[PDB]
Design a protein around this ligand. Structure first.
Ligand SMILES: *[C@@](C)(CO)[C@](*)(O)[C@H](Cc1ccccc1)NC(=O)[C@H](Cc1ccc(OC)cc1)NC(=O)[C@@H](C)NC(=O)C1=CC2=CCC=CC2=C1C
Ligand SMILES: [Mg+2]
Ligand SMILES: [Mg+2]
Ligand SMILES: [Mg+2]
Ligand SMILES: [Mg+2]
Ligand SMILES: [Mg+2]
Lengths: 222, 195, 204, 226, 233, 196, 211, 195, 196
């Protein structure tokens, strides 16, 4: 019997700063125990200072991104070159996903950018369209490995201030872009060690008021 | 839903229907009224799959109310029961059938007679002196076979009905949270608030 | 239905400098229902510690069994069993039920009384040994523990530092698992002193 | 798992990777897949890991007792015959797939054995999920009358092919060389091409970060005198 | 939903400094039966693209016709059909990828795995894969079926990453491809000795080699192998 | 697999390919499918390699013990031991074996033992997945009392076609000649037999 | 999930948890399971997160169009029925959505339970989700019509806490709402981890748990 | 069978067990005592598959009574609970396991403490202040979590137990026909005849 | 079923057996499996008789209409119509057809269309359940540019072996000769071909 779905592996990671946002993902593409490509980009600049990644089944992920990029194009045509806000893009994507409620896009989608007040924003989706704005989110194969680390190192969960003994929490100080990129690299380096589908390369897209910037880092190829 | 009973006495029809509604392992409501007035002298109780029951009943209600306005005339219980049967017989061969069993209690003002019709989800109609759906009849029909007379009063009908509910409450494993009882006679439809 | 995930639970063990640590959550459940917040999964036979995750009846059963076997070992050998030897006993005992196994994920931790060398090890339900230097994980949040341990761990940590590292690995892994939590316990083990600490965590 | 066996002039060599997995997760990054049946007979296994150990230790125990009984050094055909008859009896339910190699008074030997009890003979073999990647290298570079140094190179190159191209294989390369008239040399971590890079940050916590409820001393000592 | 009947095995390919190479054997299997021995599975599109196909042969012949019709249609009302507005490898690939993903979304797939190899207008190398699921990826080396497991490891020893491409000559790349085809003949039970090879170079254009054979095979060592363990004779 | 055994004037010859597959992967391309159970009694194996190896090992044990007590066994006797195993354990076995041997009294004999455990004595026998493709060729070209060189050519040509059409068959062609002179092993490589 | 909602003298309380699950994995710690359809209408969510978000936001579109056509706010009864009719179109197609429609209209405060089967029930008190049994236990034993706003908010808060504790697929935080005739009022996000220890000390409950 | 509850207070253990027994669609009995006295200060309630429950309980009873006669000594509740657990853990890997869940309520005369043990059919033992089997805990544990103190009197324990049964009777779909309540303390075992 | 089509110097010959089975019962022992779609374009049918008859009837309709408009169609054109039907309806069909025809320009041509709906032009083709047994024989004995009498003997001998080993094949051997001279039907009975 024909199975229309597949699993191309990979893992993605979105973190929102005070005035910036990052969206990272490994560059490895796989089927079963074989490697298809060591460098197959997964995170895209979709225009209007928005970045997107659809992780899971690559064919569905490429179709969704392709459709959203198209949605952005037609938003400019129909509404006098108005900028598509990150919250408006998120809602639009919900409707793209739910159009296939009975034959789903087999992907975990994340977008990142800036909100209308200039603050960093990350939106996260499930395969059928439920979405929500978040501060921190890992998606894909090694999502369960990375998310607890982010709960601990980004939102300072289970961390208290010494001397008080559990009476006073660690305060929620914001993170710089340099500190975030460290957490991203360490997240993927750790995921590469313990997950077989993760490795080869890491591509990070950083979003600021100045635009979209890229950074690439090698990973273990085993 | 679970249990719906019906009995036709001398000058009225009495319908008793359980109050329980269950989702999962929790009883969400213990005061549910499993019935709709189709016309001033015609009442329909119902039981079957979740959701389908109310949708079907309200759909029938709308059609009979439409007929009443168009002709300025109340259809006989027999005519209503035939209309309902056809809708169920039409439904059973559909893509997704409506899984609903009904009792139709009415008073025919022309003939001055009470009438009780039992119709299952397949479209199986029978006129009866007393009736039930599902497992309800397994416990109650022996009592009704014994005690029922056609010249019974409404009060005697209620007493025989109490005996049926007591037997159900003793020997059924399920808790159906008692019953709402309604009487259909020449003066119309009324609810027995204490039972 | 899956016996390894009916009751829930987790265990993690770490090595440090002249020390080891082993920790476990306290939950016992029937799938979605939480039943006990006092179900400890760590046992000790002399100075050798054993943590067991999986089906609770088999956890209890195996503890009673290794207590039985280590008590006889001691009477005959006239000395307490060592971690390396105990590890082989666990492996042997599990494989003898190869085609009717105990649904468990054991973890051994201890320090050799003669060499002073810290030791940890893990197994699958059928006996395969995993002798790792750094850390061992087991349970329903094993994936979560792997991610935390791999990123937080560094070699040659002192007892009081190792405590913080293992506690945070467990706590944050348990908070991303529905079937783990409801309390936690951490054993810090040195060559001739052992401290046991109950952690404060969210009770949902 | 990627595992190979290569014959040469005066003996035989086997090699293996060092990754063990529980599905897509790596449990051990430095597993030892090269097992010892007797001093000069080494095997290496793929499939169910507990089965490959248990069956290796069992036959190795019986081989040692046999060697003592006969006052002779153990032969590879004995280990082979004992293994296949054991595996055949359990009709594939013991998931042990092995490459067996060694030297004895008869000479140098190289066999493969599958879980159902079938055995094969060869000059070069490969087993595991990375067997195809390794065999591609062996079929490209293997030749007759190899030297010891050429065979170790071919063996480790074959393992590397599996490490890089198969997701079920990774980390380091273990080797064991069995030459005639010599002690067998076990080369643990012969290659180390997958060292984790330094982390960007230290995650060592401030002491007191973790909240505590109760502390207590655990009595591990026996009952005391007086 | 269907099942493949008459099938073609591995298609392998790689990039080199001035272009791309692609190869595939000439066999059409009917299960375990080696039924058809003269099947061409490399299909040129113009003088700048070669499409290599594995999987169901009836679906291959269908795709072969779509491409032939694509060339015809591109020439319609196009004075620059043999120049600026000629078909590019990227155009041909995206068309096929669109078709493959549409067919899988109707649960009626083309049971194939395709590699499009070519050279673009600006001299850039093009090498991309697509299959029955609509899954696409690109890499310095690409291979289908068994070639993915056995050929890629050998070809990745020549071009392990992007920076190795300018260092790789056509003689080295062709040598690696030919060796890979021999290895597949040793080890793939649904392969044949006879195969076709195509080179698309940015300078020398399209070279299409037919009726190639696997040669320099090693079998002599078989004479010494006796029994399955204990047998000496 | 493609296996055959053919009787001729001076004795009998066994022949086989050398391919072993696990699905479409060739696990071994130089397999020896011609196995010895006694000095001049050999068998060709088809089906489950585990089953056929286990059987042939047990048969070799029985004939070694037979010889110790009663002297050299007949080819019929060897085929009976094979049969007794294949028939009584038919529910748990997948083995198709051809037995061939030489006596001075009975000369060359061939017995085939298919899946069920039945025995059939024949002038020549073919078996394996590749045998289906040469039923017509072998029937048309076989003759009784051929010479050694004629019989070698017959087996070579036959297996050449089996290999040509069957993907589960291939590699080299191995042969074993059983006569009064002794036991001769032969081998024929692809470049020789493919061009026939 | 665990959700609840009940009518009382001073309107209707609505309380939900914030957990989301993907097997044993907790995919979200802080998810919003209430939707503000309009200033006098709320909707709880239980089941498939996608189904809950899509259909309740489609309900809000349809409730807004009602206001424009009629120049008047939609009733709670009519809003619940529109939603139940949406569910009846996709009858048996595999949707999973359990919701309470809470609000205040001309008839006073209104509360309707609606599920994927097309069920539509009017009542004073409801609770949906994997932990509804735990919440019902606290509600049934402590509910009155004569509840003060302060005591009522605490009841819904304490009832979710009970479920978050015992049910493995309920927890994270508690979101509170109070519906009045001037509209709904959000009464904050309450972390269960902190709330548990607080309630334990102040109330004396959860004696079995050590802290 | 259906519902069995247990609670350990200051100086006693209280066990409540349903009275219903059902075969097919009929309730055959509404006064069934789902319990056996293992020793003068140890009581075991049980619930599970038909037939297996009583057979297992009586088998355990016989073994403990045999121990008592042999040693002229009553085993501690802890010792009895461990014996029972082992029998169930032995049973789960048998050809046909005994599908029985139990609560063991006992008063330890040595330590002067009440003790409640919950053991399921797999052999999963836990000591608890209050416990239940099957779906019973889903409805009752929230009330017990709220109201339970360890210094409660026997009378306060019964009042909290009444509240639990009332909640079950309201929200459970099944009619379990009330409960038989028994108290285990220093003076032994006695039944509360009015509940 | 055993069917084949062979090209030779003067044109092409189609050949077939005459057995139709329903399990082990022979429903028809004198079947005509050689069917005409045009004057000098014939086909051999294998698989579902209902499917192959329905297809050949539709093809005959298309070529009759082609001829009315555009003149005599090529053998390639006929094979394309077969293909288009067999390929587009592959999910609901079980048909294996060999197409053979004669032009004056292209002379004798043979196309085979197996299950999937692929087309393969060949010098000769074999198909049906009995074809498996003669792959080796036909490969060894086929030559290009044979005479009519040589080609008749080749088909006769080949199908004789197919019939001999395949129980689903048997009866008489029917043949159709397609040349410039015209269309010749042949028949060969068991007593003739069995003794070959
Ligand atoms: C309880 C947690 C029950 O498990 C609640 O019912 C909760 C309700 C709810 C959550 C969020 C928003 C609205 C309502 N339900 C779930 O969490 C739900 C459980 C579930 C799973 C599968 C089915 O199919 C029959 C029904 C119900 N879980 C989900 O819907 C899962 C699929 N959601 C996610 O995994 C998920 C991941 C994610 C990432 C980013 C943003 C949203 C995400 C979601 C919803
Ligand atoms: Mg690898
Ligand atoms: Mg009826
Ligand atoms: Mg919880
Ligand atoms: Mg072949
Ligand atoms: Mg015949």
């Amino acid at each position: 019997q024909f199975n229309p779905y597949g699993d191309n592996g990979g893992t993605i990671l979105g973190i929102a700063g005070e005035d910036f946002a990052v969206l990272a993902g490994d560059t490895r593409n796989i089927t079963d125990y074989s490697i298809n490509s060591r460098y197959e980009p997964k995170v895209f600049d979709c225009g209007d200072n928005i970045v997107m990644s659809a992780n899971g089944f690559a064919a569905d992920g490429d179709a969704l991104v392709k459709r959203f990029k198209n949605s952005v194009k037609w938003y400019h045509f129909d509404h006098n070159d108005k900028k598509l806000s990150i919250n408006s893009a998120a809602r639009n994507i919900q409707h793209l996903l739910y159009s296939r409620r009975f034959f789903p896009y087999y992907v975990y989608n994340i977008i990142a950018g800036l909100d209308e007040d200039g603050k960093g924003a990350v939106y996260s989706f499930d395969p059928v369209g439920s979405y929500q704005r978040e501060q921190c989110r890992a998606g894909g194969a090694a999502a369960s490995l990375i998310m607890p680390f982010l709960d601990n190192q980004v939102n300072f969960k289970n961390q208290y201030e010494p001397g008080t003994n559990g009476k006073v929490k660690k305060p929620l100080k914001y993170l710089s872009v340099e500190e975030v990129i460290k957490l991203v690299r360490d997240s993927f380096t750790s995921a590469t060690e313990r997950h077989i589908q993760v490795g080869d390369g890491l591509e990070i897209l950083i979003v600021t008021k100045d635009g979209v910037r890229k950074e690439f880092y090698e990973l273990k190829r085993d | 839903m679970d249990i719906i009973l019906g009995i036709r006495v001398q000058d009225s029809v009495i319908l008793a229907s359980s109050k329980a509604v269950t989702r999962g392992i929790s009883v969400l409501k213990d005061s549910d009224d499993k019935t709709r007035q189709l016309s001033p002298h015609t009442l329909m109780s119902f039981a079957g799959e979740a959701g389908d029951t109310v949708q079907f009943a309200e759909y029938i209600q709308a059609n009979i109310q439409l007929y009443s306005i168009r002709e300025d005339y109340e259809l006989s219980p027999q005519a209503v029961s035939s209309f309902v049967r056809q809708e169920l017989a039409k439904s059973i061969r559909s893509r997704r059938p409506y899984q609903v069993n009904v009792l139709i209690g009415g008073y025919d003002k022309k003939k001055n007679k009470p009438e009780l019709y039992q119709i299952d989800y397949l479209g199986t109609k029978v006129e009866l002196p007393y009736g039930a759906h599902g497992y309800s009849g397994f416990y109650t029909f022996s009592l009704l076979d014994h005690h029922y007379r056609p010249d019974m009063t409404t009060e005697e009908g209620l007493d025989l009905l109490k005996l049926c509910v007591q037997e159900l409450e003793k020997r059924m494993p399920m808790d159906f949270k008692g019953v709402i009882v309604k009487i259909v006679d020449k003066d119309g439809i009324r609810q027995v608030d204490d039972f | 239905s899956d016996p390894s995930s009916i009751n829930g639970g987790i265990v993690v063990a770490m090595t440090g400098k002249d020390c080891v640590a082993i920790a476990c959550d306290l939950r016992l459940g029937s799938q979605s229902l939480g039943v006990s917040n006092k179900f400890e999964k760590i046992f000790h036979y002399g100075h050798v510690f054993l943590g067991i995750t999986g089906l609770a009846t088999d956890v209890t059963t195996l503890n009673e069994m290794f207590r039985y076997k280590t008590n006889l070992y001691k009477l005959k050998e006239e000395r307490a069993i060592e971690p390396e030897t105990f590890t082989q006993l666990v492996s042997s005992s599990l494989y003898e039920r190869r085609f009717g196994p105990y649904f468990v994920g054991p973890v051994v931790a201890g320090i050799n009384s003669k060499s002073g060398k810290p030791f940890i090890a893990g197994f699958d339900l059928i006996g395969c040994i995993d002798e790792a230097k750094d850390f061992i994980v087991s349970g329903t949040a094993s994936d979560q523990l792997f991610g935390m341990c791999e990123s937080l761990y560094e070699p040659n940590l002192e007892p009081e530092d190792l405590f913080e590292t293992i506690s945070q690995a467990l706590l944050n892994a348990a908070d991303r698992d529905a079937l783990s939590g409801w309390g936690a316990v951490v054993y810090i083990i040195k060559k001739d002193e052992v401290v046991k600490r109950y952690l404060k965590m969210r009770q949902d | 798992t990627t595992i190979v066996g290569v014959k040469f002039n005066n003996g035989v060599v086997i090699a293996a990777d060092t990754r063990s997995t529980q599905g897509p997760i790596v449990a051990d990054k430095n597993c030892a897949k090269l097992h010892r049946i007797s001093p000069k007979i080494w095997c290496a296994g793929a499939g169910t890991a507990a089965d490959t150990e248990a069956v290796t230790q069992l036959i190795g125990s019986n081989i040692e007792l046999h060697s003592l009984y006969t006052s002779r050094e153990p032969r590879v055909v004995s280990a082979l015959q004992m293994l296949k008859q054991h595996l055949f009896k359990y009709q594939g339910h013991i998931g042990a797939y092995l490459i067996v190699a060694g030297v004895d008074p008869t000479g140098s030997h190289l066999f493969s054995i599958h879980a159902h009890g079938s055995t094969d003979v060869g000059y070069y073999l490969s087993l595991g999920s990375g067997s195809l990647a390794a065999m591609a290298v062996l079929e490209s570079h293997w030749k007759q009358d190899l030297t010891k140094e050429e065979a170790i190179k071919l063996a480790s190159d074959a393992i590397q092919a599996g490490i890089w191209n198969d997701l079920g294989s990774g980390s380091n390369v273990d080797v064991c060389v069995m030459e005639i008239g010599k002690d067998a040399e076990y080369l643990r971590n012969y290659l180390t091409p997958n060292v984790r890079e330094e982390k960007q940050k230290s995650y060592k916590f401030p002491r007191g970060t973790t909240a505590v409820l109760k502390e207590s001393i655990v009595n591990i000592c026996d009952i005391q005198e007086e | 939903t269907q099942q493949p009947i008459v099938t073609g095995t591995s298609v392998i390919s790689m990039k080199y400094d001035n272009g791309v190479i692609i190869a595939a054997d000439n066999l059409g299997s009917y299960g375990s039966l080696l039924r058809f021995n003269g099947v061409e599975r490399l299909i040129p599109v113009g003088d700048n693209t070669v499409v290599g196909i594995s999987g169901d042969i009836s679906d291959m012949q269908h795709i072969e016709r779509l491409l032939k019709d694509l060339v015809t249609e591109n020439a319609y009302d196009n004075p620059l059909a043999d120049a600026e507005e000629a078909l590019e490898p990227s155009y041909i690939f995206e068309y096929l990828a669109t078709v493959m993903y549409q067919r899988r979304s109707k649960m009626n797939p083309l049971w194939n795995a395709i590699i499009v190899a070519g050279v673009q207008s600006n001299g850039d190398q093009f090498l991309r894969y697509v299959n029955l699921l609509g899954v696409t990826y690109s890499s310095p080396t690409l291979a289908t079926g068994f070639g993915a497991h056995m050929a890629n490891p050998l070809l990745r020893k020549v071009v392990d990453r992007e920076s190795d491409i300018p260092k790789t000559t056509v003689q080295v790349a062709e040598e690696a491809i030919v060796n890979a085809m021999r290895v597949l003949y040793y080890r793939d039970a649904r392969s044949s000795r006879n195969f076709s090879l195509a080179i698309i170079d940015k300078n020398t254009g399209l070279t299409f080699k037919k009726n190639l054979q696997v040669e320099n095979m090693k079998w002599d060592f078989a004479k010494d192998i006796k029994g399955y363990g204990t047998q000496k004779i | 697999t493609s296996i055959m055994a053919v009787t001729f004037k001076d004795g009998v010859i066994l022949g086989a390919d050398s391919r072993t597959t696990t699905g479409a992967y060739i696990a071994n391309r130089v397999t020896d499918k011609l196995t010895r159970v006694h000095d001049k009694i050999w068998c060709c194996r088809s089906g489950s390699a585990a089953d056929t190896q286990a059987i042939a090992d047990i048969v070799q044990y029985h004939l070694e013990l037979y010889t110790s007590q009663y002297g050299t066994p007949s080819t019929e006797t060897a085929a009976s031991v094979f049969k007794e195993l294949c028939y009584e354990n038919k529910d748990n076995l997948t083995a198709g074996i051809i037995v061939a041997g030489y006596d001075d009294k009975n000369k060359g004999e061939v017995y085939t033992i298919p899946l069920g455990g039945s025995v059939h004595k024949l002038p020549y026998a073919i078996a394996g997945s590749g045998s289906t493709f040469i039923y017509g060729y072998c029937d048309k070209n076989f003759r009784e009392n051929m010479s050694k060189e004629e019989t070698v050519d017959f087996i070579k040509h036959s297996l050449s076609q089996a290999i040509k059409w069957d993907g589960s068959s291939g590699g080299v062609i191995r042969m074993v000649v059983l006569t009064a002179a002794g036991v001769e092993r032969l081998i024929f490589y692809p470049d020789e037999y493919e061009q026939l | 999930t665990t959700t609840l909602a009940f009518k009382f003298q001073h309107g209707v309380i609505a309380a939900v948890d914030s957990r989301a699950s993907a097997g044993s994995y907790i995919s979200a710690l802080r998810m919003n399971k209430v939707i503000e359809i309009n200033p006098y209408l709320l909707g709880t969510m239980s089941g498939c997160a996608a189904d809950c978000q899509y259909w309740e936001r489609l309900l809000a579109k349809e409730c807004r169009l009602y206001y424009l056509r009629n120049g008047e706010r939609i009733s709670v009864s009519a809003a619940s029925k529109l939603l139940s009719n949406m569910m009846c179109q996709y009858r048996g197609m595999g949707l999973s959505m359990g919701s309470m429609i809470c609000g205040w209209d001309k008839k006073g405060p209104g509360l309707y339970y609606v599920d994927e089967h097309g069920t539509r029930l009017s009542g004073n008190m409801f609770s949906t989700g994997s932990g509804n049994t735990y919440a019902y236990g606290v509600l049934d034993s402590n509910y009155k019509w004569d509840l003060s706003v302060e005591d009522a908010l605490y009841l819904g808060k304490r009832s979710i806490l009970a479920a978050a504790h015992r049910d493995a697929y309920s927890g994270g935080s508690v979101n509170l709402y109070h519906v009045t005739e001037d509209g709904w009022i959000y009464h904050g996000n309450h972390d269960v981890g902190e709330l548990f220890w607080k309630v334990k000390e102040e109330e004396g409950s959860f004696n079995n748990v050590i802290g």
